[PDB]
């Protein structure tokens, strides 16, 4: 014992770093991907409701020409 | 001594370590909060585009209606037209024939 304990000490602690480390990224990494999967959702729906409309603001478009001209 | 070498590789080894967690708090923290606002900047270009979507929907409908509208008085006044000379071209259709 002596310089022994300061080792053993340091030896601890850096396991205790390392499963730290570990940790974090598990749980920054179950995160992230749950986001970046909302965000995909989202892009798509944005997609198809921006298709909609200028669907329909196509037509009414046409169906105000249709009818101007008549 | 050669224990003092060991000591002094096992202190860098945990500065290290702490700066190497640190960091990822740090970037974890920066990327989370750049998707949840991204998130909301989704969250709302959608209610934007479902909004002018809808705006546009029913204002079709509308217009739709109009047309049908005057499809109906076209029409009308057509089933009227070929009903009323139908009645007169076989009057005065008659009046010749009897000469």
Redesign the interface.
């Known amino acids: 014992d002596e310089?022994?304990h300061?080792?053993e000490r340091?030896?601890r602690?850096?396991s205790g770093?390392?499963a730290?480390?570990e940790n974090?990224?598990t749980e920054?990494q179950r995160?992230?991907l749950q986001?970046?999967g909302?965000?995909s959702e989202?892009?798509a729906?944005?997609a198809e409701?921006?298709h909609?409309?200028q669907q329909?603001?196509d037509?009414?478009e046409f169906?105000?020409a249709?009818?101007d001209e008549?």
């Open positions: 310089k022994d300061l080792i340091l030896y602690e850096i770093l390392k730290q480390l974090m990224k920054s995160v992230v986001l970046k909302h965000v989202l892009e729906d944005l409701q921006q909609l409309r329909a603001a037509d009414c169906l105000r249709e009818l008549l």
